[PDB]
RNA sequence: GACGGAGGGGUACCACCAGACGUGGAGUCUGCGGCUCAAUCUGACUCAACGCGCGCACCUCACCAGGCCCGGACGCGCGGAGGACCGACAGCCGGGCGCGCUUUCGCGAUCGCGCGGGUGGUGGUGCAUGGCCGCUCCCAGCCCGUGGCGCGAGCCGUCUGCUCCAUUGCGACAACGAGCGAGACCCCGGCCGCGGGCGCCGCGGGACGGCCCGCGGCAGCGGGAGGACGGCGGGGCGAUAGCAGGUCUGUGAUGCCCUCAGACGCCCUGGGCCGCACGCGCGCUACACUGGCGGGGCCAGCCGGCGCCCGCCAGGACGCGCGGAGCCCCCGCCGUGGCCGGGACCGCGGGCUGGAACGCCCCCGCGCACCAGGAAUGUCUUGUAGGCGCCCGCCCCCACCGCG
């Protein structure tokens, strides 16, 4: 059935970690968190504006 | 290269008697003096040997203004790490001059002899606070911005 | 006593929290021949994101930096003694203690 | 007229392996460190066995979505759809034409007609 | 849609035993760890994320299991009304208790 | 030390004239045809470029000594940037094959005997190269 | 200078901080209504000891303490936690007027 | 209040002047506008759009050409279990996918319908609106209590003196006390000390307009010396009040409204954003003679791993965990020749990686324009301008961009 072509493509399908957004994965330190998502979750991870 | 324990890391034994720091433009030169036979070599390299040959004449300034009897006999081994090239030479110059000063030591008016060297060259005994600045958002360089389209 | 060499490493966001855990490990270890603490060069974790969610405006950027400082303590003791030291050490929640044999 | 040291008929009857040693980097490594996919490979034997079995004028000229498969010397003599991103482009492969992707000979773009 | 009755009943049990589930949502093909089962062939197999969600949603839709959604995750908290319906599917017994039913008291 | 007192330019140029009488290394033909580097604009016209490079590697080697310098290490002493592009130039390495021959050939003459991470001078070579410097200063 | 710059734990510590943000989100999802204000997990001894500073502790226990470690069990599917290895320190938060999240709830 | 080709003072290299490097002229690139196309997904449009929304061969992906697939939960009404669904070798159609056919094979209510309802959606409206941001804003004002003055709108303090970047103060005053902005504070240097230490790195202190001289009601104000440093280090956080500024296209931020199974749902396959007169909005490299191009002395600071062996490289193998720029400086080669200036366009190969080049690099052709840039523009006062390189963000691939 659909399984024959089901998601057959193999390539990164990386997404932002907190969100479901696909762009700006920002995997700099392995934080797969989102960029627009990051502003909402930066201090908890310990980054600060200083 | 950067503030390490490289102050004396290279040399073991033969403790060099004097330790004098010279610094210009992020370049570290610790001066080690043993009061020998006229060894002013710094960076285990001769005073005549230099990256810019013309620049060497400036690094001989204590030698011309201060008595040569000082440089006639001395011993030196200086660890210079950091600096583009010319930064290293002024740092070296700060090191050796302070190294000669550390040798004078006991005479109380050591400063008075040293100030003849300050009067001819200020900053030969002093370290500058000049350091590279930083860029900001929208700026290709530290004190500029992308050219503005409309006033 | 099979005196194993243990290397204790502590990585924490706050200097105020880190100094307190460092003091306890030094304080607990005077009986066990503890080597003095090693301060790590600060580990910068800068992330720069243009603050605006949309593209409007001269993009202004948020440099969000997390500072990591790690502390190395060498101890030569038995496997149990670190456990006895553990009850005395004041545990700050979430600070990391790494036992390296 | 002679292609890569082989005359048109010689290269036409030569195997894919035969023309491969003297060829461009993309072509040599297409099978050299790689090979073909099973879908790509199957398509070959959906025209090959038809190109060698002519009963008259071809009734096939099959329409295929697959496009960037490097053409094989044998597949010379037949018209392939080489689907551009919308409509199939019928393409007859010349014998000197072989040794490059079927992508090069297919146009998915507008030629010009703007400049307003 | 073919969801095995062995995938169903064992899956219900994993959720029932811990009274909990935390799955990073997967749009399509996925394997959910923590739940494993026996196929008709006697093979130990893990279920599928697409299939598992179709049952997970159904049990929170029945109201048997309370559910939370934190962006891309389902956090399942089973209800007591749910425990009785789970027993009506598993063919298990009323005395059996979810493992967190008691014992986390802190003095 | 006098090997740190012989200016690098004087040491390297003077050492290769007797290395020419020596017949040491034997610079090959393809190497004297190829242009050094993957960023050089065109081939150096030194003609005896390989022989002049051989006086360049073993002098910097005296300072490196025990720490050792691998094939990339001597390429580092002569590292350059491309001078001809519309877009800006990012720094790149010089040619590996020409450098791999110069210290591999030097291993053959026994002046360099190496068995560590990449290459180190045999003491006989360190002494002899230093001895050429001993002749150079005084 | 002789130590790997690939210090594996240096990355691990920030993972605990995203665990902290995920925990914050986890409790924000429905336990903020239950009163969740602040969180701190402890994985130093692999205890996974979490402090849920909250306006009123009794809400999560309810009447049987059944769901108290179910929150830890939810984390058990995610991080292989064991009931009781992990702990929920839901305690009293005094001067709740000072607390902001629940004050605005 | 707001305007004013009204005045009286302030202040800012976003203002200007003394200067500087520019840009616009040249080529090249990237983003627009405007075209074309089956399709060129789009938002933005004076500062305050236009290398910007974090690196489109695929995915992303919004759009075009083709089709698969349900994932129509939960309740009742049905159909009804050897009968709900669902899989299928060949011969196919068809890139293709047992989709649907011929076929003759397997399943076993796990369900199919009818409804009511859930069902997603980078689909519309940001003049539904959240959050956050752009600006006003190199920019200081805001308001409360009590008391005054006014029928009241409002005044007063909150100031027609001086000082400060600044209601910043000091004086004086129907106002008198408060406050919130600015300050303070925090981040990194200028330097040193104590504990230490592998990784020089944690904790203190310290330049205080302190003192000198002149003026200062006084606050302040110059000239000064000592001095790591002269009276904020380089940064962040930033009031009241707004804007119908931007974003529903980041989202479990979402209202109304639409498409809800031949789907705007969701998978595959090939497109496109890399098409595209002219025009622009940033960039980049040039026009050589303080330049080349030359081998060959090198030198960092972000904070970073190397070896060996083949291959011109590109790279590849085999491995061990380990380590650094350019410009410039060298001696040379070289006549003012679109030149051995410049490096375009573009034939011929070698590779890389990726399902796949249409991405990219290297080698070898080739030698575009351009020989100092008209109006009209910017951006900046010390480690500053410029010049010259490193790293990251994104990313299989790929920087001229941006943060540093």
């Amino acid at each position: 059935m659909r399984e024959t072509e089901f998601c057959t493509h193999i390539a990164h399908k990386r997404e932002c970690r907190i969100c479901g957004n696909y762009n700006s994965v920002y995997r700099k330190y392995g934080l797969f968190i989102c960029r627009r998502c990051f502003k909402e979750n930066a201090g908890k991870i310990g980054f600060v504006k200083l | 290269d950067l503030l390490e324990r490289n102050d004396i890391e290279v040399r073991e034994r033969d403790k060099y008697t004097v330790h004098t720091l010279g610094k210009k433009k992020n370049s570290v030169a610790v001066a080690f003096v043993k009061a020998g036979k006229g060894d002013i070599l710094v960076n285990n390299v001769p005073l005549a040997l230099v990256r810019p040959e013309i620049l060497r004449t400036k690094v001989s300034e204590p030698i011309m203004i201060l008595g040569e009897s000082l440089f006639k006999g001395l011993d030196m081994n200086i660890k210079v790490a950091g600096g583009g090239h010319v930064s290293q030479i002024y740092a070296v110059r700060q090191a050796i001059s302070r190294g000669v000063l550390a040798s004078v030591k006991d005479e109380a008016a050591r400063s008075e002899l040293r100030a003849k060297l300050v009067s001819y060259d200020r900053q030969l005994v002093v370290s500058d606070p000049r350091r590279c600045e930083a860029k900001k958002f929208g700026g290709r360089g530290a004190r500029a911005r992308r050219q503005k389209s409309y006033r | 006593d099979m005196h194993q060499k243990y290397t204790i490493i502590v990585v924490g966001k706050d200097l105020k929290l880190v100094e307190r855990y460092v003091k306890s490990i030094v304080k607990e270890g005077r009986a066990f021949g503890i080597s003095g603490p090693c301060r790590a060069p600060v580990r910068r974790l800068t992330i720069t994101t243009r603050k605006s969610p949309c593209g409007e405006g001269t993009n202004t950027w948020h440099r969000f930096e997390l500072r990591m400082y790690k502390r190395t303590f060498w101890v030569t003791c038995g496997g149990n003694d670190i456990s006895t030291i553990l009850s005395k050490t004041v545990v700050i929640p979430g600070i990391q203690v790494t036992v390296e044999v | 007229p002679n292609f890569r040291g082989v005359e048109v008929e010689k290269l036409a009857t030569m195997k894919i392996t035969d023309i491969l040693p003297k060829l461009n980097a993309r072509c040599r490594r297409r099978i050299g460190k790689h090979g073909l996919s099973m879908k790509h490979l199957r398509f070959v034997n959906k025209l090959r066995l038809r190109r060698a079995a002519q009963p008259s004028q071809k009734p096939k000229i099959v329409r295929t979505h697959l496009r960037d498969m490097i053409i094989f010397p044998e597949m010379i003599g037949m018209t392939v759809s080489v689907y551009n991103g919308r409509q199939f482009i019928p393409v007859e492969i010349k014998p000197p034409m072989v040794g490059r992707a079927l992508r090069e000979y297919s146009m998915s773009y507008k030629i010009v007609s703007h400049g307003k | 849609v073919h969801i095995p009755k062995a995938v169903y009943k064992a899956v219900y049990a994993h959720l029932y035993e811990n009274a909990s589930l935390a799955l990073k949502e997967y749009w399509r093909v996925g394997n959910v760890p923590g739940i494993t089962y026996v196929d008709e062939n006697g093979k130990l197999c893990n279920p599928t994320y697409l299939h598992v969600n179709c049952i997970m949603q159904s049990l929170e839709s029945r109201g048997v299991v309370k559910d939370t959604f934190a962006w891309r995750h389902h956090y399942y908290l089973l209800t007591e009304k749910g425990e009785q319906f789970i027993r009506k599917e598993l063919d298990l017994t009323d005395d059996v208790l979810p493992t967190p039913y008691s014992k986390p008291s802190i003095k | 030390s006098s090997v740190t007192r012989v200016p690098a330019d004087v040491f390297i140029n003077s050492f290769a004239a007797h290395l020419k009488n020596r017949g040491i290394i034997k610079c090959p033909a393809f190497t004297d045809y190829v242009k050094t580097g993957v960023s050089r604009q065109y081939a150096p016209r030194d003609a005896d470029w390989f022989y002049i490079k051989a006086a360049s590697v073993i002098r910097h080697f005296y300072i490196s000594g025990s720490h050792s310098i691998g094939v990339a290490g001597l390429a580092r002493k002569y590292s350059s940037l491309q001078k001809g592009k519309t877009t800006p130039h990012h720094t790149k390495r010089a040619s590996c094959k020409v450098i791999r021959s110069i210290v591999s050939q030097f291993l053959g003459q026994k002046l360099l005997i190496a068995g560590e991470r990449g290459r180190h001078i045999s003491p006989n070579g360190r002494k002899m190269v230093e001895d050429f410097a001993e002749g150079l200063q005084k | 200078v002789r130590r790997d710059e690939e210090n594996v734990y240096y990355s691990k510590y920030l993972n605990d901080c995203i665990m902290e943000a995920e925990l914050h989100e986890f409790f924000s999802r429905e336990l903020v209504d239950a009163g969740y204000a602040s969180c701190s997990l402890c994985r130093t001894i692999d205890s996974i000891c979490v402090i849920i500073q909250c306006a009123e502790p009794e809400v999560v226990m309810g009447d049987n303490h059944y769901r108290l470690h179910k929150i830890e069990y939810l984390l058990a599917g995610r991080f292989m936690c064991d009931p009781k290895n992990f702990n929920i320190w839901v305690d009293k938060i005094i001067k709740r007027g000072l607390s902001a999240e629940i004050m605005v709830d």
Side-chain angles (χ1 to χ4, degrees), chain C residues 16-59:
Chain C
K16 319 285 118 173
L17 279 196
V18 150
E19 209 110 307
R20 292 179 266 244
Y21 204 67
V22 166
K23 284 181 242 188
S24 51
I25 300 239
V26 181
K27 217 227 97 219
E28 261 59 78
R30 271 173 186 207
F32 303 98
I34 204 215
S35 187
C38 165
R39 343 276 229 128
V42 162
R43 317 205 44 124
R44 266 187 236 247
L45 256 246
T46 55
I47 297 286
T48 154
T49 69
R50 10 151 7 231
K51 324 179 190 276
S52 347
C54 55
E56 238 56 48
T58 19
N59 299 349

Side-chain angles (χ1 to χ4, degrees), chain F residues 8-29:
Chain F
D9 221 5
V10 176
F11 182 99
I12 73 217
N13 307 327
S14 317
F15 184 67
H18 100 292
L19 249 223
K20 265 130 221 234
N21 315 109
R22 258 314 290 137
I24 268 187
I25 283 222
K26 238 102 54 77
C27 2

